[PDB]
Amino acid sequence: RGHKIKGTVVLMRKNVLDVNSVTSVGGIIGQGLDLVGSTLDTLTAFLGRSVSLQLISATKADANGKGKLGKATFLEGIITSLPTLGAGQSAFKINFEWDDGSGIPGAFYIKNFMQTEFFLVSLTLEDIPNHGSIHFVCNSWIYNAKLFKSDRIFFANQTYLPSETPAPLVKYREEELHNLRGDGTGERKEWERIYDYDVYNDLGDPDKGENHARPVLGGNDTFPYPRRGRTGRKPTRKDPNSESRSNDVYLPRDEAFGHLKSSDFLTYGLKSVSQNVLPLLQSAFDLNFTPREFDSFDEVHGLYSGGIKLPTDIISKISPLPVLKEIFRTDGEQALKFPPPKVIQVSKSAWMTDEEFAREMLAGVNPNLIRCLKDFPPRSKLDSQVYGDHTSQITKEHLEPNLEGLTVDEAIQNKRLFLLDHHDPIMPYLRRINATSTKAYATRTILFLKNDGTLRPLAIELSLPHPQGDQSGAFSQVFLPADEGVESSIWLLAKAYVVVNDSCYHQLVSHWLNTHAVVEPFIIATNRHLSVVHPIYKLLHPHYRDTMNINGLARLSLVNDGGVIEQTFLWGRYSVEMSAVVYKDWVFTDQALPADLIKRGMAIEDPSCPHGIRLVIEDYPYTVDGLEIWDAIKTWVHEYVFLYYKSDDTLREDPELQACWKELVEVGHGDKKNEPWWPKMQTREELVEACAIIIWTASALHAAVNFGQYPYGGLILNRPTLSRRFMPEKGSAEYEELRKNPQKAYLKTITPKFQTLIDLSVIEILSRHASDEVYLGERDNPNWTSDTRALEAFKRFGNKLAQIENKLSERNNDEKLRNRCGPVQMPYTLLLPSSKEGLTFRGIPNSISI
Ligand SMILES: [Fe+2]
């Protein structure tokens, strides 16, 4: 007897997912008639000889060893309703012929014969013998069949290690991987799923003119860099070593995530700030429709209340903009409002306190930098400029003021001296930097641990490059706390010059290089060498969502010449290249949270403690919370790796893992290919350690470093991005204005009103959760694996993350932990694992989605 295997295809239309057609606006989704398909009878168009599916057997091979073929069969009727049919999805039924001889299906080929591509989500088979239902999760765009030599193949639910591949599917598995790799030539087309590497020869535009040229980041000892996804474009005409610029930056097709709500297309929203808002805003400044400058602090505060009064003309073209509707509020006509940033929702003035300044190094936008001070004076790593032979000029006499009354030696002994050091990367470029419109210092802040457990700043060292040459060291001045008179204002100016350094390092290193840039060679290596079926592919896959897409954007628009990062932040046109010089010190294994903590002296290893380490400041929120998160990931990654791999030998026998990690190392981070610290793939503990660092980086680290951007920085007074004026000197007229009107002096020193609007527009988006976000650990999409052991393991991650959330909230209810809240009363929630959509100050995503 023949039997018919009963089949269920779930796909989504492009019109349901594509920005241009989803361009109405969207505000509530997970709904509609939870899009039935059915309704609006255009589903009938999938139903002739339009799309064919062809089952592939996993138990029966042909003469040359490959799985037997089913007979190409077309979609047969429209399925209106299914218990799991989600919003915007459409369902089609299709019955395949099989027998007691075509075996157990473990794969299928698919052919779109229609004009338009569609996102196939899943296929489900309801079977024949003593075999349960087979689920296939596809999640991949299917373009017209004419574009492919070998038809689109998908595999079932079952997780297989390469040894565990069913013999009839071994060639198919390997052959997909081959198709994914490519040959490293050609221009990469929209419809392609081809994964490879290039250097960042990408960011500059020397055909527009030589001042638009940027250096090649990567491939070299001066400017080493992580690789980025390969695009195929022609060389620029002027420099054959750079790639020509395009509006249209390729990433492998399935890496670009479509959306159901239009408000959720944040990259388009970001491309819209730079290409539509910026020039229309520019206009209004350049002609004379808004004042060029802020005059008082209340004028900055007026951006959240009354907004920026703008002509109806230009407001008419920035307010029907698709995504940007959710980030701009319009009262009617002359108004462009920003949401109250969470740093001012209680106190407007509290940002200026010394407690908040010191505290935001433990718990703000960049809570990752501070060092425990172990000797004195603090020394430089810099070379032949003479202060890594000399030092800091902050002195023992500067440091003995008010609080305890111990010596600086004794302050170091008892672990109560700490350091924000922003001297070494920005010094060597500082002379160049200061010869643009930027006026900046290379800074140092020495912080004291007080009795209540809070941090208090005790000295700020402001350094300028060279009276008489680089071989002459630094010229440095030193500024002490004062809360009275003109001295108070000089001090608040001295904090502005530190924060400005910090904004910059944060954006290029703590944010861009440490998450975004660095995760990319990992995504490429995984797709080139780990099959969709592979266990580690499935572990690591959620942690990659939309990442190549936002990096493809940033290359076109954030990290490019004259881009937002360049226009906005302290290092200017030197930003991305200085970030590469810092990457010379990037060590993968030091990106593990305990390693980072111990290295910066903020933790020490103690096997009598909660996580086997002990903090030297208890109330270092970022880090007590981070540590809870780190251990949850590393426990999850340990149960998951150790589920699949019985021995270290099974790992060394795993040729997919081995080739993947080889390519990561020798190619993806190939400028670090001889570094002694890379985990070999010799040991299961090494795979756990690297899988935990990939996930930490892409989820929790990216979140701690990213979602606190608009809440802390949406107030430009709190996190300025550029200083454009040196400190007022005693005799000068700038000094009498500092006396007379210090708010005006503050403002002429920081980011101008125009770039502030750009900076606020950018980070407001960068701090938003898209509705359709998939957060840490509670979350994936459907039936990812039929291996219930892994599924159980994942549930234990979710439960523990949930338990951690209650425990973190508990800590923000604690008035004893002062550093969690500040004078600004902003609970530290940036590591709370779950979130709603929007500009929340919380929610850890699986990946770098923005
Ligand atoms: Fe980001």
Swiss-Prot record:
Residues 31-156 form the PLAT domain. InterPro entries: LipOase, LipOase_C, LipOase_C_sf, LipOase_CS, LipOase_Fe_BS, LipOase_plant, Lipoxy_PLAT/LH2, Lipoxygenase_dom_3. It is an enzyme of class 1 (oxidoreductase). Fe cation binds at residues 511, 516, 702, 706, 850. Keywords: Cytoplasm, Dioxygenase, Fatty acid biosynthesis, Fatty acid metabolism, Iron, Lipid biosynthesis, Lipid metabolism, Metal-binding, Oxidoreductase, Oxylipin biosynthesis. Pathway: Lipid metabolism; oxylipin biosynthesis. SUPFAM superfamilies: Lipase/lipooxygenase domain (PLAT/LH2 domain), Lipoxigenase. GO terms for molecular function: linoleate 9S-lipoxygenase activity; metal ion binding; oxidoreductase activity, acting on single donors with incorporation of molecular oxygen, incorporation of two atoms of oxygen. Residues 227-236 have a biased composition (Basic residues). Binds 1 Fe cation per subunit. Iron is tightly bound. One of its GO terms (biological process) is fatty acid biosynthetic process. It holds the Pfam family Lipoxygenase. Belongs to the lipoxygenase family. Monomer. Plant lipoxygenase may be involved in a number of diverse aspects of plant physiology including growth and development, pest resistance, and senescence or responses to wounding. It catalyzes the hydroperoxidation of lipids containing a cis,cis-1,4-pentadiene structure. This is Seed linoleate 9S-lipoxygenase-3. The lineage of its organism: Eukaryota, Viridiplantae, Streptophyta, Embryophyta, Tracheophyta. The gene is LOX1.3.
